[PDB]
């Protein structure tokens, strides 16, 4: 039951300055069996899905400019940008996978002046209703990756809700959706579904399917490809 805090919540700087953002974990994230700090960092610009910046506290994701680096171990972590740029405006979140899957509250950074996951099926419903968001996968071997649904509630916070394993043998839910939501996958047609029942206003969010990444040296404990996000609005 790990709580991550981030600081500062918000700051504005000028192009080219260095910034450091911190992430403090209420409990150590260094896993002694695996040798790794199960902590990742995401950048989310407005109107887009999160993008994986760093995992294992310090390993930069492929394709990320090297002005981004991650540091720290145990309970205190840091993301720094050496010479920030205009395209670096976004909210930055840290994310631990030591116990379940939980995100920090985010740091909003302002500047003072063929893998595809296409989603479908959001919309409006009233409390008690049901909806089914879905995720079509293309451009990679769907049946090798575990897949996850995480949402962005209006209040700026990301929240993991469900995970299904690569072959579909193992299924995990957040307590906040357990018994109401049902995740499923079909590895024959490369699709992922979230069947949502007994919807409540707290369920209103942008909903993202996302691929649990892994490499030749182990799972990232992070998600490297996200769909575009479909809105779910619980009514009245």
Residue numbers in the entry: 149 to 384
Article, verbatim:
Mucin 16 (MUC16) overexpression is linked with cancer progression, metastasis, and therapy resistance in high grade serous ovarian cancer and other malignancies. The cleavage of MUC16 forms independent bimodular fragments, the shed tandem repeat sequence which circulates as a protein bearing the ovarian cancer biomarker (CA125) and a proximal membrane-bound component which is critical in MUC16 oncogenic behavior. A humanized, high affinity antibody targeting the proximal ectodomain represents a potential therapeutic agent against MUC16 with lower antigenic potential and restricted human tissue expression. We describe the crystal structures of a single chain h4H11-scFv and describe its interaction with MUC16ecto composed of 26 residues (31thLQNFTLDRSSVLVDGYSPNRNEPLTG6th; numbering from TM) to understand the binding mechanism through the comparison of the apo and the MUC16ecto-bound scFv at 2.36 Å and 2.47 Å resolutions, respectively.
The scFv, [VH-linker (GGGGS)5-VL], was secreted into the culture media under the control of the signal peptide located at the N-terminal and then, purified as pure homogeneous monomers using Ni-affinity and SEC. Structural analysis demonstrated that all six CDR regions are composed of 5 flexible loop-like coils, a short-helix (α1), and canonical disulfide bonds at the C22-C96 of VH and C23-C94 of VL that are formed to improve the correct folding and thermo-stability. The overall architecture of the scFv is ∼ 37 Å tall and ∼ 46 Å wide between the tips of neighboring loops. The VH domain of the scFv is composed of 11 β strands (β1–β11) and 2 short helices (α1−α2), while 13 β strands (β1–β13) and one short helix (α1) for VL. The C-terminal of VH is connected to the repeated Gly-Ser linker loop and following VL begins from D149 residue. Our crystal structure also revealed that the straight distance from the C-terminal of VH to N-terminal of VL was ∼ 32.0 Å, corresponding to a distance of approximately 13 amino acids (∼ 2.7 Å per aa). It is worth noting that the number of amino acids constituting the linker region between VH-VL must be more than 13 residues to prevent an inactive or aggregated form due to the insecure space for interaction between VH-VL. The VH-VL complex are likely relatively independent of each other, and associate only through the interface. A buried solvent-accessible area of 926 Å2 (calculated by PDBePISA v1.52) capable of forming hydrogen bonds, an energetically cation- π interaction (∼ 5.6 Å distance) between cationic sidechain (R44 at VH), and an aromatic sidechain (F251 at VL) may improve overall stability between VH-VL. In contrast, the scFv in complex with ligand MUC16ecto showed only one melting point at each pH value. These findings imply that the apo scFv (VH-VL) has a higher independence at even pH 4.4 and unfolding of the scFv can be inhibited depending on the MUC16ecto ligand.
